[PDB]
Design a protein around this nucleic acid. Structure first.
Ligand code: FES
Ligand code: K
Ligand code: K
Ligand code: K
Ligand code: K
Ligand code: MG
Ligand code: MG
Ligand code: MG
Ligand code: MG
Ligand code: MG
Ligand code: MG
Ligand code: MG
Ligand code: MG
Ligand code: MG
Ligand code: ZN
Lengths: 101, 38, 122, 222, 38, 162, 49, 43, 18
RNA sequence: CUCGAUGUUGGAUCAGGACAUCCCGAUGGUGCAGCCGCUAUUAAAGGUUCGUUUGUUCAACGAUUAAAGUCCUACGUGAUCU
């Protein structure tokens, strides 16, 4: 959260974290929720919604990020680590922010 | 950079790195902490 | 100051492990030593020089036979670092008058009473 | 559930009335007149006095021989009295005040003309002696920091120790002597004068056994 | 010559140097490294 | 092993991960009691910098070392292989494990010097301008001291300083 | 004599080299063995008395 | 460069001499002879 | 060349009595 | 070592070398805004003044200079001079 709080959530408009907690492949996605739901990260931009959608459909976990530019980032966490998703999420924040300005 | 026989980290932001065959202390927060192994 | 060296008596008390290594019998001690000088008396104190002469060891690499008795051993201990000590072995017994002239001292320390200079038919 | 452990209690420990190190004088009360020989054998070989703990639990061990002049005592006193907690710590001297007189000849003069005049005094120290002893309601990690700082400034190889590390140090040396795989040792060879080796050795080498050379101590020697 | 106790480490007679070299501690070596066994 | 693929379609990026084929350790190791891959196959003290068939199993596709927690090596063997891999790269024995170059980068032509048993990185070493007397000679290290215990088939021990 | 043989009797010298090589290989075989093997044919020593 | 002060093998500062492998083996070989001398002088 | 001192200890030159 | 002689201060002349760099080059740190400085790393290719008094080496002083460096060379150099 410290590393992600330095960069901020300024270009981000929504972050939706979808997982089925009774499945066995959601730990990375739940760890991603823990980091982005932190008060430090969330306080960098109060206009960015962070949503946790819990399901019991048997579907694979997903992280759907909507930026203010209108672009989307979909990270499927069934075979991704929390570090990888946070690294990719940081990279796209570092890019989309430059495009807007 | 001050030459030192014994390298010591002076703050939490100092990091030890071995470059060009010798150890260095680098610090971005306080550049005065920079040290070179003698 | 450099002086004569007193050797503790414990140095000359053989342990059971030593008997296995070297093959001597504490209950049947050998009678005679084979003594050969293998070191120079140069750069050694005069008292060591003097004892080497007394033992007849002036010429290096020349075996001399000596009695294995306390008095002789006392001299040998002074110059133990200059010599090699081996037990004289008599596989065919002592030489007799008939075979006095046909003896040879082998490198094993065995004094044989017959020296044929022939191969063994065995 | 991180497992917690009990902590030692020092409530049973007592603190003296003057925990700090007393002042050491440059020269003894009455100045000496009789000039003494150099007698270098007072810093040579193992120490036979002040090798064990008496009151405290922590000390600075001497790993070599040397002479402590007054300048060394002031460094020890000030550094220790400043870094210690008087309420929970106390320190004592394990070495006497400088008593051995050291003569000097006036600068620029030639050899001869008698002996010089007494210049200063020193305290001889042998290897294996405790120089300062500390104790009180404290662990080893608390005092070891500034004790090693003092030990580094001594004129001989020194090191801060405790009742435990000193004991382990000694038992580790005995273990090395027992499991030594080398069939040849300095003691066996020297005592039996093998190879006539006593012609290059000293009479003291019969007791030092190759662990001591002049004032230097070699702990890795068995 | 120099005295038996010197401020520097005095050079040894060559025979004594050899004596020291030949009488160095040799640690017991296990047949199989203990870390390679259960 | 696991691959991570980034597919950008229009305005939407999709990051996924797939599980590819994974190699399996050969069956029936000669020393099942062994505690790491090296001693399980009786390889301790019996490999060198040029044993790329061995070394290549413990490195990443771009030549980097793999963590000790993943490979299962002990600290001692892990350090030996690490040094052996550095020497293998410097000797040119791993031509298909080169560093990743970003698009548009073509290294300039550099002088080719054949070398082997190279302990240090070339750029970090200074010339020996003053060799010193015979009794205090400055030596040129060859090989690695980590391999000092390797099986020696000659009566002369490995010379690590030339 | 060995130097003379090398120059003027090279076939005899090669035989001597072969003999030495054979005796050398027998040494290795013996050293590797645990005493089970009998002595090498060329390793047998003629005893005198 | 690399001069030894005064004469090489005397005095305070000397040329250092090192112990070679064969110097060690030579010494050990004579130590074994003397050790055996001790034994045969014990009976 | 500074002028030096002198030893203040006289006598003590007797030979051994045997 | 040299007294059946290894010529003894300073200067002139010509300088060889070390770098522990005075100036010029490249860098890190700074209680480095800038202009000036201080400190350290690297660098010995090139350069490093003229005068009054003093036998002086030095020192003081005048006027300059990018700078007026520290040392070794039989305190370099008298079969070259003084
Ligand atoms: S545990 Fe056997 S070599 Fe690593
Ligand atoms: K010290
Ligand atoms: K000398
Ligand atoms: K003269
Ligand atoms: K004048
Ligand atoms: Mg003396
Ligand atoms: Mg000389
Ligand atoms: Mg008298
Ligand atoms: Mg008299
Ligand atoms: Mg003449
Ligand atoms: Mg010049
Ligand atoms: Mg420099
Ligand atoms: Mg001159
Ligand atoms: Mg001339
Ligand atoms: Zn710092």
């Amino acid at each position: 959260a410290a590393a992600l709080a330095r960069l901020g959530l300024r270009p981000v408009k929504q972050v939706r974290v979808q997982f089925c907690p009774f499945e066995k492949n959601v730990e990375s996605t739940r760890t991603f929720l823990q980091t982005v739901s932190s008060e430090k990260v969330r306080s960098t931009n109060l206009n960015c919604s962070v949503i946790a959608d819990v399901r019991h459909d048997g579907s694979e976990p997903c992280v759907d990020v909507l930026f203010g530019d209108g672009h989307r980032l979909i990270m499927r966490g069934a075979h991704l680590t929390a570090l990888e998703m946070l690294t990719a999420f940081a990279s796209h924040i570092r890019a989309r922010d430059a495009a807007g300005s | 950079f001050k030459n030192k026989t014994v390298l010591k980290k002076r703050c939490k932001d100092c990091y030890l790195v071995k470059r060009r065959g010798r150890w260095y202390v680098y610090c971005k927060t306080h550049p005065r902490h920079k040290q070179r192994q003698m | 100051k450099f002086t004569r060296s007193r050797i503790p008596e414990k140095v000359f008390q053989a342990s059971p492990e030593d008997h296995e290594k070297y093959g001597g019998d504490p209950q049947n001690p050998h009678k005679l030593h084979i003594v050969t000088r293998i070191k120079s008396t140069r750069r050694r104190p005069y008292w060591e020089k003097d004892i080497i002469k007394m033992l007849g060891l002036e010429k290096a690499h020349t075996p001399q036979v000596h009695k294995n008795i306390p008095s002789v051993n006392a001299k040998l201990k002074v110059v133990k670092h200059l010599i090699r000590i081996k037990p004289l072995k008599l596989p065919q017994g002592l030489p007799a008058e008939e075979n006095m002239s046909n003896t040879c001292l082998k490198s094993t320390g065995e004094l044989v009473v017959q020296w044929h200079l022939k191969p063994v038919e065995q | 559930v991180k497992t917690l452990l009990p902590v030692p209690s020092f409530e049973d420990v007592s603190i003296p009335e003057k925990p700090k190190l007393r002042f050491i004088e440059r020269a003894p009360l009455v100045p000496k007149v009789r000039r003494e020989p150099k007698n270098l054998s007072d810093i040579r070989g193992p120490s036979t006095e002040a090798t064990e703990f008496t009151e405290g639990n922590f000390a600075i061990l001497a790993l070599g021989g040397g002479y402590l002049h007054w300048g060394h005592f002031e460094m020890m006193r000030l550094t220790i009295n400043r870094s210690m907690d008087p309420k929970n710590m106390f320190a004592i001297w394990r070495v006497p005040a400088p008593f051995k007189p050291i003569t000097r000849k006036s600068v620029g003069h030639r050899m001869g003309g008698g002996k010089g005049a007494i210049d200063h005094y020193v305290t001889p120290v042998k290897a294996g002696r405790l120089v300062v002893e500390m104790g009180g309601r404290c662990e080893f990690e608390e005092v070891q920091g500034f004790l090693d700082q003092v030990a580094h400034k001594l004129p001989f190889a020194a090191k801060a120790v405790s009742r435990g590390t000193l004991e382990k140090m000694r038992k580790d040396q005995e273990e090395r002597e027992r499991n030594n795989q080398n069939p040849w040792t300095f003691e066996r060879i020297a005592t039996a004068n093998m190879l006539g080796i006593r012609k290059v050795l000293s009479p003291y080498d019969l007791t030092h056994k190759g662990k001591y050379w002049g004032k230097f101590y070699m702990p890795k020697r068995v | 010559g120099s005295k038996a106790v010197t401020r520097h480490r005095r050079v040894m007679h060559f025979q004594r140097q050899k004596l020291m070299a030949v009488t160095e501690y040799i640690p017991p070596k296990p047949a199989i490294h203990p870390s390679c066994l259960p | 092993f696991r691959e991570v693929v980034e597919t950008q379609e229009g305005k939407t990026t999709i990051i996924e991960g797939r599980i590819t084929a994974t190699p399996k350790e050969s069956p029936n190791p000669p020393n099942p009691s062994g505690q790491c891959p090296i001693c399980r196959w009786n390889l301790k003290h019996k490999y060198n910098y040029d044993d790329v068939l061995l070394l290549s199993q413990f490195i990443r596709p771009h030549g980097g070392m793999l963590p000790r927690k993943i490979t299962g090596l002990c600290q001692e063997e892990h350090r030996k292989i690490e040094e052996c891999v550095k020497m293998a790269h410097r000797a040119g024995l791993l031509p298909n494990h080169r560093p990743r170059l970003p698009e548009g980068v073509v290294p300039k032509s550099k002088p080719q010097l054949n070398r082997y048993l190279t302990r240090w990185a070339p750029g970090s070493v200074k010339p020996i301008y003053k060799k010193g007397p015979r009794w205090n000679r400055v030596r040129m290290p060859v090989g690695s001291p980590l391999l000092r215990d390797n099986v020696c088939y000659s009566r002369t021990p490995w010379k690590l300083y030339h | 004599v060995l130097a003379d043989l090398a120059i003027y009797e090279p076939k005899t010298f090669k035989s001597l080299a072969a003999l030495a090589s054979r005796r050398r290989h027998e040494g290795f075989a013996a050293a590797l063995g645990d005493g089970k093997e009998p002595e090498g044919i060329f390793s047998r020593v003629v005893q005198y008395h | 460069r690399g001069r030894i002060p005064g004469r090489q093998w005397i005095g305070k500062h000397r040329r250092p001499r090192f112990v070679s492998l064969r110097a060690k083996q030579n010494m050990i070989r004579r130590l074994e002879i003397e050790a055996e001398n001790h034994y045969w002088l014990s009976m | 060349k500074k002028s030096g001192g002198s030893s203040k200890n006289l006598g003590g030159k007797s030979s051994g009595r045997r």
